[PDB]
Design a protein around this ligand. Structure first.
Ligand SMILES: [Cl-]
Ligand SMILES: [Cl-]
Ligand SMILES: [Cl-]
Ligand SMILES: [Cl-]
Ligand SMILES: [Kr]
Ligand code: NA
Length: 129
């Protein structure tokens, strides 16, 4: 499913991401934009054999099982496929564990290269929230 901007914002808020671990709603929306263009079905294979899945491009090396990432962990205890659903619940639940890990949203390369230090409030400006 391909979310619209405010739609996703609303969905993320509902799921508790606004200011989660101090990251305001517009960081999550910005990260989703550039990670997956808001497409729950996005997948990208990495050089190490791992794969990133879903709207927040969560990686199979640590967070989900895809049966093809040898020696990987499944810290969110979930099939990577769950992450591709049009219901963002699984991605959100897993994202909270990742941003709680230790380096916050820096875990999302697109986020620190394209969102961090920018006016991320602009991603929700306009939305009925
Ligand atoms: Cl914001
Ligand atoms: Cl695996
Ligand atoms: Cl949803
Ligand atoms: Cl942080
Ligand atoms: Kr998400
Ligand atoms: Na894994």
């Amino acid at each position: 499913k391909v979310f619209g901007r405010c739609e996703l914002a609303a969905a993320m808020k509902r799921h508790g991401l606004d200011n989660y671990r101090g990251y305001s709603l517009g960081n999550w929306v910005c990260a989703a934009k550039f990670e997956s263009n808001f497409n729950t079905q996005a997948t990208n294979r990495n050089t190490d054999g791992s794969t990133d899945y879903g709207i927040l491009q969560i990686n199979s090396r640590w967070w989900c099982n895809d049966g093809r990432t040898p020696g990987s962990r499944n810290l969110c205890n979930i099939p990577c496929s769950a992450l591709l659903s049009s219901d963002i619940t699984a991605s959100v639940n897993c994202a909270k564990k990742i941003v709680s890990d230790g380096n916050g949203m820096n875990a999302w390369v697109a986020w620190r290269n394209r969102c961090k230090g920018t006016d991320v409030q602009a991603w929700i400006r306009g939305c009925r929230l």
